[PDB]
Amino acid sequence: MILVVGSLNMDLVLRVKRLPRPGETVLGEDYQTHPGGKGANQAVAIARLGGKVRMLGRVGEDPFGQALKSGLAQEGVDVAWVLETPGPSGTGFILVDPEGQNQIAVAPGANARLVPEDLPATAFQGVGVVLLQLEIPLETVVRAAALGRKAGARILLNAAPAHALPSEILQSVDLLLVNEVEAAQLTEASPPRTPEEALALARQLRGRAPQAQVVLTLGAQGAVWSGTEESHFPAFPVRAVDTTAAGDAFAGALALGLAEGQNMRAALRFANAAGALATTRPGAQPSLPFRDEVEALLFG
Amino acid sequence: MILVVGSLNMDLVLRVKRLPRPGETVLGEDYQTHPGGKGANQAVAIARLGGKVRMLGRVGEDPFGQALKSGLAQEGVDVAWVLETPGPSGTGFILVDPEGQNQIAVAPGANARLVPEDLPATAFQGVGVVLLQLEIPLETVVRAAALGRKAGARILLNAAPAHALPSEILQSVDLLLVNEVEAAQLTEASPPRTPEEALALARQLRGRAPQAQVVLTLGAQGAVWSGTEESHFPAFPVRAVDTTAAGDAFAGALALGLAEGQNMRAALRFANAAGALATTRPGAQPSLPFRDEVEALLFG
Numbered sequence A, B: 001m002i003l004v005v006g007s008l009n010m011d012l013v014l015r016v017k018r019l020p021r022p023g024e025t026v027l028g029e030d031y032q033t034h035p036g037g038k039g040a041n042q043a044v045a046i047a048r049l050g051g052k053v054r055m056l057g058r059v060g061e062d063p064f065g066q067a068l069k070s071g072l073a074q075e076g077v078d079v080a081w082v083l084e085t086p087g088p089s090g091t092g093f094i095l096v097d098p099e100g101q102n103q104i105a106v107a108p109g110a111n112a113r114l115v116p117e118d119l120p121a122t123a124f125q126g127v128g129v130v131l132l133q134l135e136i137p138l139e140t141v142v143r144a145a146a147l148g149r150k151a152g153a154r155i156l157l158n159a160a161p162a163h164a165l166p167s168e169i170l171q172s173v174d175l176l177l178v179n180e181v182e183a184a185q186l187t188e189a190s191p192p193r194t195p196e197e198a199l200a201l202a203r204q205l206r207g208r209a210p211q212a213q214v215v216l217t218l219g220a221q222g223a224v225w226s227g228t229e230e231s232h233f234p235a236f237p238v239r240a241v242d243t244t245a246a247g248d249a250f251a252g253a254l255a256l257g258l259a260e261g262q263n264m265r266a267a268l269r270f271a272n273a274a275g276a277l278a279t280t281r282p283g284a285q286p287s288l289p290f291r292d293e294v295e296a297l298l299f300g
């Protein structure tokens, strides 16, 4: 059983011919609404992947409030903890060029009012894995770590994007899960070209975070694991059609893979299969695989 | 009296730290609904300067629609010719951070449904200037220029934002108004860095629009004019916070100067005063100046 302590955003997606330069105005097409948020994506991905999960966060009392809420439950995810707030929900401002080069910005609204005291013990009860991204406040992440620990959950932090973390928040975490961009401003060195220039950046985190097994997500090249050992996990070779649900469909899948009680090697190859088959379909949440394909891909 | 035939959009302004790149969701503060669109901005720009002005354009049924119409009515814009339309209003996606930086992407909404059939002759009766931009269909620009000239109105085309123009429009226009980028796109020339290069470019644009006065704006270097004179009009020195709507303030002031029977030397200086003042306050329409300020700038 998993607890996502993470963000709920309805996204406004607006196609342009080329992305605007600074100071430049461009006309695009009519925007569309799809549920966004690393947190929500992660819960759906987990349910899709055949697993019991619950969202802890906060939706608005605008129209999109109930859509975030609804769609999440239709996937088969317990939303009992999805606490309603005034103002809008969360909203993301997505500009996609016809190639997939896109530009995302997120209005937190209801996500940035999910407070350190909103977190109630019973959200965390019976939970095997607490999954944290940073599309919710920070003290709500220091606090969500501590309560997941008190409930006997493994703390998986998906840091998306990167900040400066004191070793306060890495002797607290059971697994750190990052992509190239994040690994780069969590160390202040050259972003990883090879799996070697990564497996290094791994020990340069595992350095800060002794008993936190570190996972680093490469794209096209997969991911490396520097913990009980040092390893590289080949990506699955498939047509990079769309990379919405990046270190994200991986994150949900890893969280679910460890919850369901798979060894680390298998949950990583599960997360690779997951966030590869994410790329072969267009869009955020419709791309996020069912257990059917992943379990079928992972034998053929 | 001025008819503006053009766009009405609700600006959504997200206040973020940095502007993104691929596969990297970025976290703002909270979007802030502001009334916008080049057509409504220019119409408001004309009314704040004490101009008689009509807006001909399409807002959607949605709540932004009723808010855009009232907004204009509240500023003294004749909104008799503002049409309700199924679907959503146009929407400004306006990312804005500390230094000011603005990445305007425009969802067209009901603006894209403003068709030639929607321009009735009485909106043109007794109009001295028809003021157009390029956030409505090109077929509507053609028809608006024909109806303006039938009624004896001067046709001012603000060819913004940047767009190829067929010779049927270019041959139809009394005044062609463009910034550096629109000039360069219509001429396949390098954007000019000096009034001397901008006049040469203005002169070349005039070969596609030989019946037109051509005006080319240079932000902090003012504007050039190619037609009955070849001249530079200096920028007013000011503290610029947000260059958004500065073009609108420029286009509206020029329009109004000419409606009032000012020569181009007077109306361009007038336009440079209004443009300068729009840079000094934050946001789009809100930053458009009142005539007393422009008059205070014009003669210190």
Ligand SMILES: Nc1ncnc2c1ncn2[C@@H]1O[C@H](COP(=O)(O)OP(=O)(O)O)[C@@H](O)[C@H]1O
Pocket: A179, A180, A217, A218, A219, A220, A221, A222, A223, A235, A236, A237, A238, A239, A240, A243, A245, A246, A247, A248, A249, A250, A271, A272, A273, A274, A275, A276, A277, A278, A279, B023
């Ligand atoms: N931007 C990213 N940076 C790093 N790893 C990523 C990124 N996006 C996705 N991943 C994950 O890393 C692995 C390899 O990238 P992926 O996009 O699958 O490449 P491929 O198209 O070769 O399958 C996958 O498991 C994927 O989910």
Ligand SMILES: Nc1ncnc2c1ncn2[C@@H]1O[C@H](COP(=O)(O)OP(=O)(O)O)[C@@H](O)[C@H]1O
Pocket: B160, B179, B180, B217, B218, B219, B220, B222, B223, B235, B236, B237, B238, B240, B243, B245, B246, B247, B248, B250, B271, B272, B273, B274, B275, B276, B277, B279
């Ligand atoms: N920094 C500035 N100082 C003074 N006037 C300015 C400044 N920036 C813009 N303006 C005024 O606004 C007008 C239009 O500016 P410009 O940036 O060319 O418009 P656009 O927004 O259409 O690109 C200028 O011609 C001038 O009148």
Ligand SMILES: [Mg+2]
Pocket: B242, B243, B244, B245, B246, B278, B279, B280, B281, B282, B283, B284, B287
């Ligand atoms: Mg301004």
